[PDB]
């Protein structure tokens, strides 16, 4: 009797209790008087967020239409001010909405001015108003030594850039490649920095532990990574030593070419052909929660259409990784496809026949013959569908000249429509492309370095491009 | 036509200090390097500073880093030296030269080719450090 | 510093050829192009050679020039007696943020 009254005022006590987490006014529908619509409360859908899910409708013909219409954006990153400074090693990494931004700031002439400045920045990429995806770079970082610090690459994981660079006290570690120590830098930079951080906003994280295997030296190289969960995928490079390079010489697609040999793409994987060190392209791996300072993991590629490491780029487009590396040998025709495997990495190389990068006088553009060189051009393509699988990019129109930026629209098999970023004559030479999702809009910023004829400097010029809808 | 025409040389005594001047014709300093270079008599030649085209660029030698100064009048045309703290083995015939950098960007890793050289040479006039 | 070597003295009948090479680190002259001056005594320097191989606008085609590795050449050849000077290969060093010039050829040409 009394029992099942104590358990009626047991279950009241335990079912009308509002034992509950804070309100939140945005969340709950909030009715004021003559009101603004509060059609839709959800993250990452009010600024930039990354190519997922399933977003708007680009054309999709081939046209003669002028369709694509750049914005010059530069101004948003500093490339700009004194005309004196040569500007150096850009890099644009784009995750959810976030950027990092990296130059080399030298005074004067691009090839022996004194560096002022490597600055790492990074940010947020957002629309300030004026109806373009602009950046907004508030947390900047700048090393002791800027003439030491090459290769940056970046990746975003949990409210930080993480940006990895080589230490090197021997020039371009590519260059000096056999007396380099390879040392490492890790710059964690926070996008959203709170004042009075002190260890939130940059952070420099000590990495004294590499796993390489086979190769001797690693580096990071390309632009920008993933995250996987707490997983960093660096862009990277192996410098494999050339007598242990095991490489069957048959391999070689020698056939449909009556000039090459079954030395060439033995040879032409360093940077000159009696290269002590062969450049592998690959990730590197770093696990965040491998515990306090966890260690960086080589992860070599696979040797399918493989050629030099040149720099790299996995970046997440509509769900799946996609891996890119520039063409700096023979294979001119541009190497970039969906990434099958991340650790061992296999990469789906698309069978590309339309989009190729210039090359001086040996490999030149529309080059597919097995020929010693070291030449070409980081020119980037990013992915913007899947079901068509088209992409889209910064590419040099030219055969043999690094000149017309254009930025342009392509399949596998076709090129669909293009805009040229500046004059025919414009030099060019290392473009960096990042789409993503504003208002579920394609954007694609595109980093260029152009040199200016009138300054005699380099300097990046960003081109935040919506992919239209129709034509 | 285009030429540079030193002025302010001569006789120094030692631990001293002495301006040179360099009168700059037929183009203007602002938009290339120069240069001085030095020749004591019996050695060869040895460069010894540069000042950037526009820019604030100051390159020294190693032997006369931290005593010898460079700087311009851009109104002036005249690139000048201010060579202070004079050793004796700075008696030499000391030019200014334009240092004329041509850069193509080349589609390679090194990305640009940067040959480079002094063309335009001035007279050269005497420092001589001595009592 | 780096002194990038020349033979210092080396000589010829006129009509004859020479070769003037020019010796240095890889940071120099690997890396970077290098220039060549002839320079007459009591007379300011002169370009006769830049990008290791081209010429300057008022330059007879007999000043030849090379760069094999981290060496360079001045082949002179047909000799006259104005060509008799000293010679200096000329070159910026990366490393050492310098112009580094050549430690003298005083080409003894007849005439």
């Known amino acids: 009797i009394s029992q099942s009254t104590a358990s009626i005022n047991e279950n009241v006590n335990e079912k009308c209790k509002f034992t509950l987490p804070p309100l939140k006014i945005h969340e709950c529908n909030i009715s004021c008087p003559n009101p603004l619509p509060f059609r839709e409360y959800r993250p990452q859908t009010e600024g930039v967020s990354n190519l997922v899910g399933l977003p708007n409708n680009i054309c999709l013909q081939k046209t003669s239409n002028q369709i694509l219409k750049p914005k010059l954006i530069s101004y948003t990153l500093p490339v700009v001010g004194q005309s004196g400074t040569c500007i150096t090693d850009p890099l644009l990494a784009m995750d959810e909405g976030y950027f990092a931004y990296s130059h080399l700031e030298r005074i004067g002439s691009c090839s022996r001015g004194v560096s002022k400045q490597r600055i790492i920045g990074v940010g947020e990429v957002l629309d300030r108003g004026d109806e373009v995806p602009s950046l907004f770079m508030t947390n900047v970082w700048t090393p002791p030594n800027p003439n030491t610090v090459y290769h940056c690459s970046a990746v975003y994981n949990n409210e930080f850039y993480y940006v990895l660079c080589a230490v090197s006290t021997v020039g371009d570690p590519i260059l000096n490649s056999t007396y380099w120590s390879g040392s490492l830098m890790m710059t964690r930079l926070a996008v959203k920095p709170k004042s009075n951080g002190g260890g939130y906003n940059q952070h420099q994280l000590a990495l004294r532990s590499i796993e390489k295997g086979r190769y001797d030296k690693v580096m990071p190289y390309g632009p920008s990574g993933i995250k996987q969960g707490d997983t960093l995928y660096f862009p990277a490079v192996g410098f494999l030593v050339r007598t242990e390079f095991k490489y069957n010489d048959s391999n070689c697609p020698i056939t449909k070419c009556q000039y090459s040999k079954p030395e060439n793409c033995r040879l032409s994987m360093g940077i000159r052909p009696n290269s002590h060190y062969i450049l592998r392209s690959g990730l590197l791996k770093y696990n965040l929660s491998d515990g306090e300072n966890p260690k960086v993991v080589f992860i070599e590629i696979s040797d399918q259409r493989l050629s030099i490491g040149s720099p790299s780029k996995i970046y997440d487009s509509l769900g799946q990784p996609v891996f890119y590396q520039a063409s700096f040998s023979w294979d001119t025709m541009i190497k970039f496809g969906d990434v099958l495997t991340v650790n061992p990495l296999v990469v789906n190389w698309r069978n590309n026949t339309v989009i190729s990068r210039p090359g001086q006088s040996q490999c030149p553009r529309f080059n597919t013959c097995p020929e010693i060189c070291w030449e070409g051009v980081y020119n980037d393509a990013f992915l913007i569908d899947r079901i068509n699988w088209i992409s889209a990019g910064v590419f040099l129109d030219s055969n043999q000249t690094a000149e017309n930026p254009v930025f342009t629209v392509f399949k596998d098999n076709e090129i669909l429509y293009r805009a040229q970023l500046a004059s025919e004559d414009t030099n060019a030479q290392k473009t960096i492309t990042n789409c993503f999702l504003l208002k579920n809009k394609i954007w694609c910023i595109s980093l260029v370095e152009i040199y200016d004829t009138g300054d005699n400097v380099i300097r990046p010029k960003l081109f935040a491009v919506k992919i239209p809808e129709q034509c | 036509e285009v030429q540079l025409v030193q002025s302010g040389g001569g006789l120094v005594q030692p631990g001293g200090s002495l301006r040179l001047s360099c009168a700059a014709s037929?183009?203007?300093?602002?938009?290339?390097?120069m240069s001085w270079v030095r020749q004591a008599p019996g050695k060869g030649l040895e460069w010894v500073s540069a000042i950037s085209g526009s820019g604030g660029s100051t390159y020294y030698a190693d032997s006369v880093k931290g005593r010898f100064t460079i700087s311009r009048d851009n109104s002036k045309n005249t690139l000048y030296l201010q060579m202070n703290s004079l050793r004796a083995e700075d008696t030499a015939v000391y030019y200014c030269?334009?240092?004329?950098?041509?850069?193509?960007?080349?589609?390679?890793?090194?990305?640009?080719?940067?040959?480079?050289?002094?063309?335009?040479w001035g007279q050269g006039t005497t420092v001589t450090v001595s009592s | 510093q780096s002194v990038v070597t020349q033979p210092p003295s080396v000589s010829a009948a006129p009509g004859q050829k020479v070769t003037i090479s020019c010796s240095g680190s890889?940071?120099?002259?690997?890396?970077?192009?290098l220039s060549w001056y002839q320079q007459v005594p009591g007379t300011a320097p002169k370009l006769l050679i830049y990008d290791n191989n081209k010429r300057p606008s008022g330059i007879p085609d007999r000043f030849s020039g090379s760069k094999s590795g981290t060496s360079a050449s001045l082949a002179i050849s047909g000799l006259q007696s104005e060509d008799e000077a000293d010679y200096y290969c000329?070159?910026?060093?990366?490393?050492?943020?310098?112009?580094?010039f050549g430690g003298g050829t005083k080409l003894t040409v007849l005439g």
């Open positions: 000329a070159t910026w060093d990366d490393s050492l943020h310098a112009w580094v």
């Open positions: 037929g183009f203007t300093v602002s938009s290339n390097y």
């Open positions: 890889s940071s120099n002259i690997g890396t970077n192009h």
């Open positions: 030269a334009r240092d004329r950098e041509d850069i193509v960007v080349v589609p390679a890793p090194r990305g640009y080719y940067y040959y480079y050289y002094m063309d335009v």
